[PDB]
């Protein structure tokens, strides 16, 4: 087609395995960094506690509520409250979640991310839905109550990035490898007898030609072709972790061009 090229190896709701050729390592990495840190997500940010009869602390629970993944598909049409014009929050900038739970049962009563209810007007946008990947359809286990154990609270979810808090991290681990045969001599293999026998062969070795000993060292050789795997948490779909990552980095660069323009 044009410049750098992609070749997807495997896909799911949760994973994207692909090959990125005709790219600078610096670019591959900068994208990898952005996916981890700069993609916006919606996550619980304020927790007003009306009642808590639980064995857990108000803030212990509060902390967990932030780590619960929320639907951030249409996150782009929500404003950062900081940029919003209200007094604290509103609809244009937040999602209000409610959680009322009580131990009616003699048996232990469980509190799940499913038990969260949206109270704010969604403006008909795909946002704030607790992500349920759970087979039984419960989502994240927030708490356990016994008998008169009541938990009544209110959550304000806000747009944010992983730089502010890791709760707004839409990506789990991002796998990243290049040159499975150390052709580039980018690592000096620690060994005891044989580095080839001692160090396990990469999966990606199959997608590259072995060096063949009867050849001189390619110094001219440079790093292109990157075997990556992007894992999603739920907030954004796997593809959009890649796309939005590409786009964020693009926007980030545009700001610099624009800054120079104003100067």
């Amino acid at each position: 087609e044009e410049g750098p090229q992609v070749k997807i190896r495997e896909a799911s709701k949760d994973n994207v395995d692909f090959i990125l050729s005709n790219v600078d390592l610096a670019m591959a990495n900068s994208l990898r960094r952005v996916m981890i840190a700069e993609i916006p997500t919606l996550a619980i940010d304020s927790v007003e506690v009306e009642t808590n009869t639980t064995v857990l602390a108000d803030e212990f629970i509060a902390h967990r509520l932030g780590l619960i993944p929320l639907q951030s598909m249409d996150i782009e049409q929500l404003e950062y409250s900081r940029d919003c014009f209200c007094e604290d929050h509103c609809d244009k900038c937040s999602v209000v979640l409610t959680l009322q739970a009580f131990g009616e049962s003699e048996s232990t009563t469980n509190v799940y991310s499913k038990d969260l209810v949206i109270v704010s007007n969604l403006m008909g946008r795909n946002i704030g839905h607790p992500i349920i990947q759970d087979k039984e359809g419960n989502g994240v286990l927030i708490c356990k109550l016994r008998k008169g154990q009541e938990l009544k609270l209110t959550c304000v979810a806000k747009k944010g990035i992983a730089k502010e808090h890791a709760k707004w991290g839409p990506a789990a681990a991002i796998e990243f490898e290049y040159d499975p045969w150390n052709k580039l001599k980018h690592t000096d293999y620690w060994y005891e007898q044989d580095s080839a026998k001692e160090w396990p062969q990469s999966k990606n070795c199959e997608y590259e030609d072995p060096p063949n000993e009867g050849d001189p060292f390619d110094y001219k050789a440079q790093a292109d072709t990157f075997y990556m795997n992007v894992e999603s948490v739920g907030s954004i779909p796997v593809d959009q972790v890649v796309v939005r990552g590409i786009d964020t980095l693009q926007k980030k660069v545009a700001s610099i061009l624009l800054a120079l323009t104003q100067m």
């Binding site: 410049g3 610096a26 960094r33 502010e164 590409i246 980095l249 693009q250 800054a259 120079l260």
Partner: protein, 114 residues
């Protein structure tokens, strides 16, 4: 307690420009751009692209201390060529490269049935 606010990493300070371009004294046709509320994510990316420019003689960036999200980038170009223009072109090249990367990923993704 002595902990700085987390947004200080990305949100520009009161009266604080993203870029501050100062000229290098020690070398002819060389400049020093300080990037506020930025990290390696952008620094190493720009530096590597300026390296691809033939008319660029010197390019390097450094995050002088990790407590602060800012980096100094030094650009030296051949006489007649402007380092601000060099930075402008590398910035553009990056965008155009990313634009193709997105297009190529999108096309390839749409082909998958999973």
């Amino acid at each position: 307690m002595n902990a700085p606010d987390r947004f200080e990493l990305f949100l520009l300070g009161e009266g604080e420009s993203k870029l501050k371009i100062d000229p290098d004294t020690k070398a002819p046709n060389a400049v020093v751009i300080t990037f506020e509320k930025e990290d390696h994510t952008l620094g190493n990316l720009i530096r590597a692209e300026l390296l691809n420019d033939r008319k660029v003689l010197f390019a390097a960036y450094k995050v002088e201390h990790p407590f602060f999200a800012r980096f100094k980038l030094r650009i030296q170009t051949t006489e007649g060529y402007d380092p601000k223009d060099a930075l402008k072109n590398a910035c553009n090249s990056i965008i155009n490269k990313l634009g193709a990367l997105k297009t190529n990923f999108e096309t390839e993704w749409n082909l998958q049935t999973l």
